[PDB]
Design a binder for this molecule. Structure first.
Ligand SMILES: CCCCCCCCCCCCCC(=O)SCCNC(=O)CCNC(=O)[C@@H](O)C(C)(C)COP(=O)(O)O
Ligand code: SF4
Ligand code: SF4
Ligand code: FES
Lengths: 112, 47, 118, 83, 94, 684, 208
């Protein structure tokens, strides 16, 4: 195995914390520039949720690649490459809630 | 066409219709196949 | 313990709720050819298909309905499924068992293999 | 109240030898003593032998029979019967 | 081209919207496009050719402008031979 | 004594008598063939198998030429390619230009082998031949002009089907294949000729013109019409089942499927239950939401307990639904879970798996020397098992005897008689056949489930066990006792502990009866209490549905993944091919949802967890394609002797005596229009 | 004679084979296999570590002056452990010849950027990263080209469905273009076209 950027999990965690800092400070600027109607707390909660989604990763290379992708997304947001549609896609506003209980899935459709 | 008439076929239309979009004669798509699955018809007697 | 699930970009529902079948496709009984039975195939579980109201065309919401992958060996397909975090079921290859064929048996003196017509 | 008992044994595993002995020797007597009690004998592979006792309303308890001699299996089954 | 109980014109395929079906709304102020010419009736109308040979060939007319050439056996007196493509029928005389 | 031969310079060791074609198969080269089928006998007529052997002036037919040591098979030499080109040109000289209209197009051996081993143009400048088409039945559409006289159909009909009704009439280019008279080729395995035929001369009438091969999506699944467990490929296009094709499982079905399996899918398109139905004030079933019907059944379930709640399982139900219903009823403290087929409860009964399994697997039949069939018509009850019996009879000279009504099994057999008393005679040793069984090195005795369904079934089972015990006393690894089940669900239900037979319901009428696709009619409203609440969960509404207060739509075998165990005890899983119609849902999901509504939620919430529960109840169920089994004949025989029931004098008569009975035996078959047409053809 | 069949040029075949042996000898450390196709194309197979060294050797005149990177791409073969096969196509205008160098990588193993050697690999490597999942280390700027700004998956990967997992539409409620799960009104009809009969005996794989 050849390390992408970090030879051990602790170094990757350090990189992840740096990326989280960058996003946390960028969130208010994003709300201001993109004229988003979400609050800063809401965007930072979404940032935490996106970070938490991949909290199960235990391999340093996967974490490093995830940090790279997050940095690319942050660069997109810091510039105006991503539009308000792209920024608000993280909040699935249009999509209706999907029930997760067995009975609701049984009622709604054949999907497992 | 006057010098060289087209071949005469029965199925060929005798009256040419212009584009009928935006008119009551506009084509409306629909399925041309019958229902695939037939459901059970419950009995009409109480029991 | 390789996991590319986070990096693939597949939504969680398909990662978790989908069962992938690893198999060697059986020969189409209509044909005697066996060339299409030489490579392992990975196919996802079938999902709902409904008729479009306008035209009756079969509509689907399963992104992986048509996704089929070819693997040289069973182990490689299993490795791919494990790396992508799909639950997998492996059906062992079915090979035609060797048979004993004799043209002479068609004209046996005492056995029942004699053929009434040629 | 016992409603059924399931015995799972491996056909060739060393652990299931005692359960196999109980089946070969004592099972007929057990069925005679309990004519209408369903004692279902089923085969398990590469897992420890176990005894399943379905009680009233579907409550079930399982006792591992791994590496149990025929006498030990008989004691376990009799204890389940006695409750 | 028969008309269904709802008043719709049944297609040659036999497709007509049942009174229960809600899809009939699509023609509410528009029309249902049905071809009046039915292939089955017109193919029936054609006369049956009588040929004096056991096997005959149908190319559909026009040579390369028709359909692949096929040879039809006319031995059976009971039933006329029918082209798989053209649908024209032939029978041996008498 | 493997001998060494070389295929294109590569050494392959093959047993003596191996044909050149099989030696090439050893190295991966598939010699082009038209008339050679491994299941069928060698003919050599097609002549496409011709290949060149190095240093040999004349090419040899790979199919019919036994290899000689030191032969080098040149499979791609100029001579072999030219022979293939010439044979292909001759085959295509008189072939009709029907490909655009031929159903075989896209799956035709002639087309592909022309595209691979033939020339790209035609030198034939003469008129082609035409052949008057023959009518051989309502299932096989015949366009004989496409015939290439491979004789596959004739050899199949003679060897496998056993019906010597198809043959060649005439000589030369005028030679024609088909009954000289207006006879109809009727057999359980007739449809397989459609598969065997290399060209589209013989095609499925029901499937004619419906679809092209490339469009179809193929799903591998298992048949449920019989307990043989034939592996099938369900071909679906645009979410609609198009045809059923055989899938090769050497052990269970070689490459064949019965006519009912092949042509009964049409029933799945008719008389389907697509919405929940609840009785209204007038007493007429009306469509209702899932919630309302499930709540009504849940209220009924909560109200009553113990024997008040009962379950009857049909032939087509799945193991997962069986376990779900068993658990749900047990939570109400009801063990009255009954199958519609009767197996002798006295003795070990369901306790020992060997008691209700075909211990000698279907493959074992070939090894056996003598088979004694008791009260079973295997031709109609289990067609592929009868086909295996005929295969062993033809090749291994198996001796077959039947105790029952004289029936045509497609092979010669000794008719001992129809009276059940003969079993006592065999056991005692008075009957001459007992000496044959004693001498037999690998004897086999098969008792059909239909015979057990008789009132004296327990005595019949005990007598057959006595015969087997005498055989064992006279002379291990071989198993001599077998039961042939005719219903798919029976083996799984017995493994799960479902009580065989409906007798328990008869003894104690239940207030609430849940019919899991039970269309047999063994139990009716008259037998039940007057106010009995009946719930029906099934794909079709045939008999149980009309007499049920609540109808819960359920999926079919094509529409769900489920475990069905064959007569051998082998568990195989179907795979989803189409989604269940309308509001119909998978059965185990229905049972689980009723559990959730009624306040007793079963632990499983996904199919894998339900399979884990099955592993808890019976480990073998989740071990797919395994028939290892266990031998407990000693204990079962010892238990059997305790009771002494006396067999009634009524002669053993199979439920199915003619092919007319075979066509419609289940809800799917009854719904099918094609099976009705076949019944009309046979009867009229 | 033989009008249909393509003419064969053995001279170019011998020259390419000789130059391939030349390259293999000069850089035994990285080259694993060199083969010349019968349509007169040369391929040198290299260990992933040797991309920069072998490419720099090829560009500089050790009797080879491949100074133009025709194209750079990857082929995803899921069966192989290193599912991605990085392919470099180079052109030597001095000798009017083209050679191909191929290497392998995994989803998690980086491969060195060749922007230093050629400088046309910036966008090609970015495309490889965007469609396939390969990461090129030391790249001046690795970001998405040809995919949507928020696109999550890596297409062209033989796992990605052709239609994708998301679809875009305009929603009046949010006055914005909003992504949603893909729901095709006509599911792409998968056609099984492969014939059951072998077409080319020359390529028959061993039975094993
Ligand atoms: C406007 C809102 C849009 C916000 C979008 C922000 C993003 O794109 S998040 C992408 C960054 N993802 C990551 O860094 C993945 C980190 N993966 C990990 O495994 C690590 O977090 C670890 C190893 C679990 C450690 O994390 P913890 O300290 O345990 O927790
Ligand atoms: S009908 Fe078909 S199977 Fe029968 S001889 Fe002709 S080509 Fe062969
Ligand atoms: S079966 Fe005969 S008509 Fe049909 S595609 Fe093949 S060669 Fe053509
Ligand atoms: S089948 Fe072709 S020569 Fe025997």
């Amino acid at each position: 195995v050849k390390p992408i950027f970090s030879r051990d999990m602790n170094e990757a965690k350090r990189r992840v914390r740096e990326l989280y800092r960058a996003w946390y400070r960028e969130v208010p600027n994003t709300v201001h520039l993109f004229q988003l109607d979400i609050s800063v707390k809401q965007g930072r909660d979404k940032v935490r949720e996106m970070f938490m989604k991949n909290a199960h990763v235990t391999d340093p290379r996967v974490v490093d690649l995830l940090v790279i992708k997050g940095k690319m997304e942050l660069e997109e947001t810091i510039n105006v490459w991503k539009q308000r549609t792209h920024i608000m896609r993280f909040f699935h506003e249009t999509e209706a809630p999907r029930p997760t209980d067995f009975l609701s899935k049984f009622y709604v459709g054949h999907d497992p | 066409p006057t010098t060289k008439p087209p071949t005469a076929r029965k199925y060929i239309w005798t009256n040419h219709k212009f584009n009928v979009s935006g008119t009551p004669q506009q084509y409306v798509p629909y399925s041309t196949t019958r229902k695939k699955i037939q459901e059970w018809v419950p009995p009409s007697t109480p029991y | 313990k390789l996991d590319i699930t986070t990096l693939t970009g597949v939504p969680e529902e398909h990662i978790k709720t989908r069962k992938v079948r690893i198999f060697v496709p059986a020969r189409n009984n209509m044909q005697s050819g066996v060339n299409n039975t030489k490579k392992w195939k990975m196919e996802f579980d079938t999902r709902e298909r409904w008729e479009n109201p306008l035209m009756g065309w079969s509509s689907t919401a399963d992104p992986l309905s048509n996704l089929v992958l070819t693997f040289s060996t069973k182990e490689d397909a299993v490795a791919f499924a494990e790396k992508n975090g799909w639950s997998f079921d492996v059906e062992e290859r079915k090979v035609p068992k060797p048979k004993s064929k004799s043209y002479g048996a068609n004209f046996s003196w005492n056995k029942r293999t004699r053929v009434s017509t040629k | 109240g016992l409603r059924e008992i399931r015995i799972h044994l491996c056909q060739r595993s060393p652990g299931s030898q005692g359960v196999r002995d109980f089946i070969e020797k004592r099972y007929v007597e057990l069925k005679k003593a309990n004519p209408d009690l369903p004692i279902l004998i089923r085969e398990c592979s590469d897992v420890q032998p176990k005894l399943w006792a379905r009680y009233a309303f579907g409550q079930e308890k399982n006792v591992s029979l791994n590496n149990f001699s025929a006498d030990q299996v008989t004691r376990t089954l009799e204890n389940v019967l006695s409750g | 081209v028969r008309t269904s109980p709802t008043g719709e014109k049944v297609t040659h395929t036999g497709q007509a919207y049942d009174d229960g079906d809600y899809r009939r709304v699509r023609f509410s102020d528009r029309q249902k496009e049905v071809n009046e010419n039915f292939a089955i009736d017109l193919i029936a109308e054609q006369p049956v050719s009588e040929v004096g040979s056991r096997v005959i060939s149908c190319d559909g007319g026009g040579g390369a402008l028709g359909h692949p050439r096929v040879y039809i056996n006319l031995d059976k007196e009971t039933k006329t031979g029918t082209c798989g493509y053209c649908g024209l029928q032939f029978r041996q005389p008498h | 004594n493997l001998i060494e031969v070389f295929v294109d310079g590569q050494s392959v060791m093959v047993e003596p008598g191996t044909t050149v074609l099989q030696a090439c198969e050893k190295v991966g080269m598939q010699i082009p063939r038209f008339c050679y089928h491994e299941r069928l006998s060698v003919a050599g007529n097609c002549r496409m198998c011709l290949v060149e052997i190095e240093k040999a002036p004349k090419v040899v037919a790979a199919c019919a030429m036994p290899v000689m040591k030191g032969w080098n098979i040149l499979t791609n030499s100029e001579k072999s390619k030219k022979a293939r080109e010439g044979v292909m040109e001759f085959l295509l000289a008189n072939h009709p230009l029907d490909c655009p209209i031929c159903d075989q197009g896209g799956e035709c051996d002639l087309q592909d082998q022309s595209m691979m081993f033939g020339s790209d143009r035609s030198r034939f400048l003469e008129g082609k031949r035409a052949v008057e088409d023959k009518n051989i039945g309502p299932l096989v559409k015949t366009i004989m002009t496409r015939c290439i006289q491979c004789t596959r159909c004739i050899r199949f009909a003679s060897e496998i089907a056993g019906v010597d009704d198809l043959g060649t009439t005439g000589r030369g280019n005028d030679m024609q294949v088909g009954t000289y008279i207006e006879k109809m080729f009727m057999s359980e395995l007739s449809g397989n000729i459609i598969d065997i035929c290399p060209v589209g001369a013989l095609t499925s009438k029901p499937y004619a013109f419906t679809a092209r091969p490339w469009e179809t999506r193929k799903t591998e699944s298992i048949d449920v019409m019989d307990a043989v467990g034939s592996n099938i490929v369900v071909s679906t296009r645009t979410g609609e089942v198009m045809r059923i094709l055989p899938r090769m499982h050497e052990d269970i079905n070689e490459e064949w499927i019965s006519d009912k399996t092949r042509f009964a899918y049409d029933g799945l398109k008719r008389q389907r239950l697509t919405q929940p139905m609840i009785r209204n004030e007038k007493g007429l079933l009306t469509y209702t939401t899932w919630e309302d019907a499930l709540s009504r059944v849940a209220g009924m379930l909560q109200s009553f307990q113990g024997n008040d709640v009962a379950a009857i399982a049909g032939g087509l139900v799945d193991a997962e639904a069986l376990v779900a219903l068993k658990d749900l009823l047990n939570r109400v403290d009801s063990d009255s879970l009954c199958t519609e087929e009767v197996f002798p409860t006295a003795g070990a009964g369901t306790d020992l798996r060997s008691n209700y399994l075909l211990n000698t697997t279907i493959a074992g039949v070939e090894e056996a020397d003598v088979i004694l069939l008791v009260g079973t018509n295997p031709r109609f009850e289990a067609p592929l098992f009868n086909a295996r019996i005929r295969k062993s009879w033809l090749h291994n000279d198996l001796k077959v005897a039947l105790i029952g009504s004289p029936v045509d099994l497609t092979y010669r057999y000794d008719h001992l008689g129809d009276s059940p008393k003969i079993l006592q005679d065999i056991a005692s040793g008075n009957h001459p056949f007992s000496q044959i069984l004693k001498e037999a090195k690998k004897p086999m005795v098969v008792l059909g489930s239909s015979a057990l369904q008789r009132s004296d079934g327990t005595a019949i089972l005990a007598a057959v066990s006595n015969i087997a015990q005498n055989i064992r006393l006279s002379s291990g690894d071989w198993k001599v006792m077998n039961i042939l089940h005719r219903i798919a669900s029976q083996v799984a239900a017995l493994d799960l502990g479902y009580k065989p037979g409906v007798e328990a319901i008869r003894k104690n009428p239940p207030k609430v009866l849940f019919l899991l696709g039970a269309d047999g009619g063994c139990i009716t409203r008259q037998d039940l209490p007057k106010d009995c609440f009946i719930i029906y969960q099934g794909h079709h509404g045939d008999v149980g549905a009309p007499m049920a207060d609540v109808i819960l739509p359920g999926a079919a075998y094509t529409e769900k993944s489920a475990t069905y165990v064959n007569t051998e005890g082998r568990a195989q899983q179907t795979k989803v091919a189409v989604t269940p119609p309308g509001l119909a849902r998978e059965d185990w999901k229905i049972i689980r949802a009723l559990s959730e509504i009624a306040g007793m939620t079963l632990p499983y919430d996904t199919l894998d967890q339900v399979r884990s529960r099955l592993e808890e109840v019976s480990p073998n169920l989740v071990r797919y394609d395994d028939v290892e089994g266990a031998n407990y004949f000693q204990q079962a025989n010892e238990l059997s002797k305790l009771v002494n029931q006396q067999l009634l004098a009524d002669p053993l008569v199979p439920p199915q005596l003619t092919i007319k009975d075979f066509y419609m035996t289940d809800s799917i078959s009854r719904a099918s229009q094609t099976m009705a047409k076949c019944v009309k053809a046979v009867t009229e | 004679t033989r009008p249909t069949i393509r003419p064969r040029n053995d001279v170019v075949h011998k020259q390419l084979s000789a130059f391939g042996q030349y390259v293999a000898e000069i850089l035994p450390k990285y080259v694993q296999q060199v083969q010349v196709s019968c349509f007169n194309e040369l391929e040198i197979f290299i260990h992933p570590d040797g991309v920069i060294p072998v490419l720099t050797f090829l560009r500089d005149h050790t009797n080879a002056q491949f100074k133009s990177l025709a194209d750079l791409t990857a082929v995803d073969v899921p069966t192989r452990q290193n599912r991605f096969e990085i392919v470099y196509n180079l052109l030597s205008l001095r000798f009017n010849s083209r050679i191909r160098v191929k290497t392998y990588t995994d989803e998690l193993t980086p491969i060195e950027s060749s922007v230093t050697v050629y400088k046309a690999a910036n966008w090609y490597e970015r495309e490889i990263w965007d469609m396939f999942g390969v990461f090129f280390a030391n790249h001046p700027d690795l970001r998405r080209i040809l995919t949507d700004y928020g696109f999550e998956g890596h297409p062209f990967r033989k796992d990605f469905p052709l239609s994708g997992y998301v679809e875009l539409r305009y929603d009046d409620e949010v006055k914005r273009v909003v992504a949603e799960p893909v729901e095709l009104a006509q599911e792409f009809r998968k056609f099984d076209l492969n014939s059951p009969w072998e077409a080319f005996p020359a390529y028959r794989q061993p039975p094993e």
